[PDB]
Ligand binder design. Sequence first.
Ligand SMILES: C[C@H](O)[C@H](O)[C@@H](O)[C@@H](O)C=O
Ligand SMILES: C[C@H](O)[C@H](O)[C@@H](O)[C@@H](O)C=O
Ligand SMILES: C[C@H](O)[C@H](O)[C@@H](O)[C@@H](O)C=O
Ligand SMILES: C[C@H](O)[C@H](O)[C@@H](O)[C@@H](O)C=O
Ligand SMILES: [Mn+2]
Ligand SMILES: [Mn+2]
Ligand SMILES: [Mn+2]
Ligand SMILES: [Mn+2]
Ligand SMILES: [Mn+2]
Ligand SMILES: [Mn+2]
Ligand SMILES: [Mn+2]
Ligand SMILES: [Mn+2]
Lengths: 418, 420, 421, 426
Amino acid sequence: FRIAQDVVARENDRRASALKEDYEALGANLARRGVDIEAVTAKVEKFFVAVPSWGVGTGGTRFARFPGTGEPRGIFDKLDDCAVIQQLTRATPNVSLHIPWDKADPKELKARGDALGLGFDAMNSNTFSDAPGQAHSYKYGSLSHTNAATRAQAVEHNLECIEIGKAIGSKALTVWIGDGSNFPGQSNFTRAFERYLSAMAEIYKGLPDDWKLFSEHKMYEPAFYSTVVQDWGTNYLIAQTLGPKAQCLVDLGHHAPNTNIEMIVARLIQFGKLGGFHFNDSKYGDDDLDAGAIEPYRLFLVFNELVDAEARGVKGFHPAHMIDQFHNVTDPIESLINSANEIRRAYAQALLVDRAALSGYQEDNDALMATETLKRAYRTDVEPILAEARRRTGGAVDPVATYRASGYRARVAAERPA
Amino acid sequence: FRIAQDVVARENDRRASALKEDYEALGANLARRGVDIEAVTAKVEKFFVAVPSWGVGTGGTRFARFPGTGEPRGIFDKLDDCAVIQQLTRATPNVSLHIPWDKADPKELKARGDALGLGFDAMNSNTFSDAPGQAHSYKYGSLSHTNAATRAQAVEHNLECIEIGKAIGSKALTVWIGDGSNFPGQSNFTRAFERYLSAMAEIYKGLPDDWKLFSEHKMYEPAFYSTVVQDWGTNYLIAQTLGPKAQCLVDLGHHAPNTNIEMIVARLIQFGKLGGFHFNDSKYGDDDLDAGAIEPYRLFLVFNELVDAEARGVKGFHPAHMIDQFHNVTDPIESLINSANEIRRAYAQALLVDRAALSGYQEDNDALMATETLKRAYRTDVEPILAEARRRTGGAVDPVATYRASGYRARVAAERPASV
Amino acid sequence: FRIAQDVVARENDRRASALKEDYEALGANLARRGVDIEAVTAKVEKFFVAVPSWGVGTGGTRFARFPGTGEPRGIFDKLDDCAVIQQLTRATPNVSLHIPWDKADPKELKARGDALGLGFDAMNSNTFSDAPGQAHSYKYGSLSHTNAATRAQAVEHNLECIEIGKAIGSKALTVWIGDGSNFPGQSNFTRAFERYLSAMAEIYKGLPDDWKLFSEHKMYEPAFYSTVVQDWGTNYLIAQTLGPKAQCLVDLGHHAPNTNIEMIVARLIQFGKLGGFHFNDSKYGDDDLDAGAIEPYRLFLVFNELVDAEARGVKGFHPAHMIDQFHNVTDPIESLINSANEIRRAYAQALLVDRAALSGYQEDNDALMATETLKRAYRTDVEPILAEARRRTGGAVDPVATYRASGYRARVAAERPASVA
Amino acid sequence: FRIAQDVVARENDRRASALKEDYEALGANLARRGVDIEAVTAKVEKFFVAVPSWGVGTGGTRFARFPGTGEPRGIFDKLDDCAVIQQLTRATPNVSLHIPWDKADPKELKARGDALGLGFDAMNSNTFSDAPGQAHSYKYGSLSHTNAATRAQAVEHNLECIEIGKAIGSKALTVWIGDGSNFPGQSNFTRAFERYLSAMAEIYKGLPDDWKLFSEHKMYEPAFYSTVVQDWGTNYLIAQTLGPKAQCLVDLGHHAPNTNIEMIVARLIQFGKLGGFHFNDSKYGDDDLDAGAIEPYRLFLVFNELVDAEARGVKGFHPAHMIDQFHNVTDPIESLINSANEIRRAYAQALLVDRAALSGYQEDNDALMATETLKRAYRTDVEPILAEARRRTGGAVDPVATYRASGYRARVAAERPASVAGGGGI
Ligand SMILES: C[C@H](O)[C@H](O)[C@@H](O)[C@@H](O)C=O
Ligand SMILES: C[C@H](O)[C@H](O)[C@@H](O)[C@@H](O)C=O
Ligand SMILES: C[C@H](O)[C@H](O)[C@@H](O)[C@@H](O)C=O
Ligand SMILES: C[C@H](O)[C@H](O)[C@@H](O)[C@@H](O)C=O
Ligand SMILES: [Mn+2]
Ligand SMILES: [Mn+2]
Ligand SMILES: [Mn+2]
Ligand SMILES: [Mn+2]
Ligand SMILES: [Mn+2]
Ligand SMILES: [Mn+2]
Ligand SMILES: [Mn+2]
Ligand SMILES: [Mn+2]
């Protein structure tokens, strides 16, 4: 227990009375709306999203990095910090690892995870930066590099990530690369994509039959003119070409300005290629900000498509959920805590949508009532449900409040002198 | 001839000396670069782009329309004006018709086109607006409308367009609809797309053996929250689902801000689904401005992909080329003339690219020289090639100058009554 | 009464029990947070936003217009419909007129307004389209047209708008023009702006002592390459150049993609040039959609800046609030009703922000708690407050439901002839 | 001479014949258009743009940095490399320094510059990152930080930059900060701006009489929700508030998608606040790519506004031209060479515009001919003018070709330590 159980209990009891009042009030309101609050809480308690190992330490921009106190010094420290997020929110039982950033003895990583009550989600490969002793540089690409030996090196790296994942219980490999060009003419769009497809086919050949392979598209950065896997269209072509175990991963901040992202989600679901999500928020580019902190309605609309898929009777749909954020000006743990909370908030609200009423307004082309039907769910303050879900499962009514009351940051600051 | 031949001859003669000097100079410059100017001229003279019947009349915005003089009323007046563009540029032998705007007896349409030296490109259906006496409104959609009878009406309309096209020599149907939603929840994205795919399959069944069906994606407008055929990804799904006769049409101004459009073109070519283009330029949204007037390099980069596809003999590559613009503050004929010119300009420059050198710099990851290889072609003023191509084929050395010298606008202004 | 009182009464009674339960529960929650729900409701019931006359009829795009039934015949029918919105929401007592669309005898306009319990907000001029009989066309511009005679014609039109406004009770003139270019080189940016400044200076000379002149910026449309009054920077230069009576109007959908609009609002307030707002929502361009239907948080963030101005004690701050929307696929009256509701919703939430706590988190650079302080207010479902405000002021607990129960649309559909040409 | 004179001569002689043919042909073409090619070349030879010291080293993104061979060890190596750009293009006689990156003995800097034939443009302060031994962190801001002591430290740093600039010959200070917020509510927009204005007022008081203070706006990055100096409107307020010595700097890649940047330039000129430029190109965000490599017409349109002003001679009007780019996948020197060339290319084409004809088409509302009047100039290949300008001023006909023939990169690679690849960071 990273956070003392007496502190969690103390801070829960301090807020118990108010929560009971709010939960009962919301329960009565939902009952008048024909909704059983217990049914919603039950589902919310089971919604999990993976926390990124790279999100526990302070992040930075190309201009600078401003570390806070008690910065995790490596993957083991990061797991310790991830354990706090899970203990308090109970929404992040699994951690996403990144190789080679998190290279360490796989057996030990698993042992630490087991002891902390943490599992492992999809592995993440890294061929967008060079490691010491690397024979070929990824400056001009990796899986799509013009040099055969460089592509082979990239493929081998991904296979190594799979081996590490098999040792810790991971069941998927997420591949995001920076491959692209900064100048017109630098790359031949088609040949580069053909090279990428051939290299990914080699990774697919080495992909276990109990694993999934996720490709992540991105409009730009680090490539500023063209990117090989630039959007969901190219991503679909990739997944379809590689095989049934290959699917598309949608990172919210990787789309062109004003893109209707929830529609992309719906399209990928319809064609069975929505592998998972990388949650975060943004306003300008791939800002990697706390989920829902900028555009909470958009997050709700994405979850509205996920819940509709269930309502439509879609089968075999269990998308992977992961947070992909960098925290440059906040306590990383607090941001991950509230981000995970925001994701459950949007999910809970999506569950409140009166699907029967919405379907009726859609068929009758009553646009105003259709949108108001979504708003009635979205406007509902589901915090009491999120808090009760946490309380009932060993977490904290007010996660960040308990975190601060525990003095954890000051504790690790003292344990991790810099 | 819409424009008197003696006027064309006269306006060519007064500009012939300068063209001779510039063509010979460009010829020597290209010769020093290992390029045969005549070879480029040969390709340029065979590049054609269809002119839109809806482009010769003055366009407008939702705020207002400011018509000019001699506004063409009806397809017959429009064809007469399109004929001027072809006569002077020799780059627009075919016209794109839009139904019901251009509805007229098929035999009469074909007869008029033949007399004017004009052919007909892809037909364009219209289920994004309501025509008088229409049984079902398209306010909430057409091919993807929730009402079965409304979808059937839209399908029937498209089949009618195919019948008209068959009668006049067309070999394709372009389908662009406004279908979408203005509010979250208004439409179920998936169900709407399912309805669209089912309706399009019916249209597909009515396609002759040698016809193509082009679906045109658009991010937004008239729908301001979601659009069924919103981007090339959805467009690809449509084409692949419908069959080999179905391909994607790319309209330059229909993409999100900063989109790499030339890459979309490359992707569609690789998978054999680049049905064609709707050329125009833009800066903010689907502005429908004169091609190349805002971002000429982007137009060149699109053509770089087109010329590259040819260079490597890509299978199934044969996109249709069409101009889709609205002229709100210029003489429509002049804008179409210069737009067709800009399109041939970008094509000619793409032809100048040293493909062998480019491939070398790409393989060696010499980004600077690779981009400079494209720039050497793009920086070349190919106007002499475009002008000489026109001069040798019955066109005008300076199309707009000849147009103005002819007094054509004043002529039709006298034959056509304005509102006031 | 456009809507029968017995219908409003019956529909309010039908929902009285639920409103009581929700309002009281919210009241208890707010109290635990140190907020007096009564204080919030009292301010909410006093928040007004002007309804656009051009928003009562169905709108359209450059591709098509799909009118509904009972479209207004003219301004008088539009005022009658605005009376419905005000009766039910009690948040829209004033109407924004547009000349020449709403041109009519000022005495008659005032008479109808008074009879319906409606007032008039800022006048709106129209030199972005040609009216019959004009000696000069606005095709290539109006107030910034290269032709002096054309500029003079546009100036006189704006002065006429002021005269009409003075007669009906208006106290401001909003000037939005399409002036700009579609091609590089078509216009000399500086000279076009100078011409505009000269024309606006003339209009300024016609302003009564207690009037304001609002200039509205827009990035593009109808001009697709450059627009004279393209953004808030140019707008500020206009207001500062003209004088103390000249201020800037911010229309939410008139900014470049990803623009931080709430900051623009803050900047104009700081330099005393925030004249007012044109509320609406959008996702792509100037979509003119129902306020808050696309990005409700942004709307709240704009109001957060407005309320912060009061918190900072900004003297003499009385921004005009107006809705500027077009309803292409809904009953215009219903959209305006829910849009006014959404505006009061964002306002109410902004009032809930614990600014004492917020100021502390800002000082200590506690970004997470600072943003959570805003979210605690925004996440609060203030619908009970909006509904109670309506109940106590003669409005409807559920405006659209009551509107539908009244059968108003069918009624006017039988009284108003549809366009046949 | 960084590049052997015999190499420059040899590589010019090799291309002299073709240049003569192209220059004479262009000369005849321009003569038919009523333009004297010599008058254009004369102006082009005098057009200068400052090179960024931070541009000669390989750049990086927040994801990774892939240095090449012969990376500069410090400011002295950087000046040596900048000397190559000036020798071959003759368009970059001045270098822009950044403190503390280029901190060194002022006398030594001045000495190296004088020896290389290089001068110094505007100084650039750095309060967007923390330096070793720094008392107060700029994590939450600098000039607009809530903490008074932090703002004071930032002000003092800027004054130090002025002192260094005075010693080496600089006549301006460019201030770009990352100050902003990543979350709604984190910052009070107004109070933050008030703090910024007050701090800048202190910096302004320390400005010499013949110096300029340039504030640089940026929509976002590093701040991802709000930025204090976010656009030209705020920038104008800053310049107008501070005084006549304060002007606005326009960096091309710092605007919202689809922004009409050339209009911003015109507006700033109209109100006398166009301090200068930071040239580069971009497609998505502040990409910092080689000028003109992505949107060459936009660069020409910006220069069209500059030449228009340079034509009707707004006097004393001398905006500071500077390149601000990062080169992540090319030889930094080659990119700066071609970028400077591209800037002169746009300038040259703008000089070809028939101003009288354009004015006429504008007054007559002949939109088509007005735009064609601009295109007639833009379509002209002015490379012969650029190459001849270089040839007769001591530069190279084909700069990059000569650079490669000289083997300079391989030369400095052998004179400098090898570099290691790593994570993000410019
Ligand atoms: C760290 C992680 O691999 C990374 O964030 C990618 O998922 C992608 O979002 C990059 O922009
Ligand atoms: C008139 C023509 O159908 C239309 O322009 C479509 O092709 C599409 O561009 C609409 O935005
Ligand atoms: C009708 C009204 O004048 C108009 O909407 C303007 O306010 C502006 O928004 C235009 O885009
Ligand atoms: C290094 C230099 O200070 C920096 O590039 C600034 O000028 C600004 O462009 C940052 O985005
Ligand atoms: Mn990601
Ligand atoms: Mn990312
Ligand atoms: Mn089109
Ligand atoms: Mn279009
Ligand atoms: Mn408006
Ligand atoms: Mn508007
Ligand atoms: Mn800069
Ligand atoms: Mn920058």
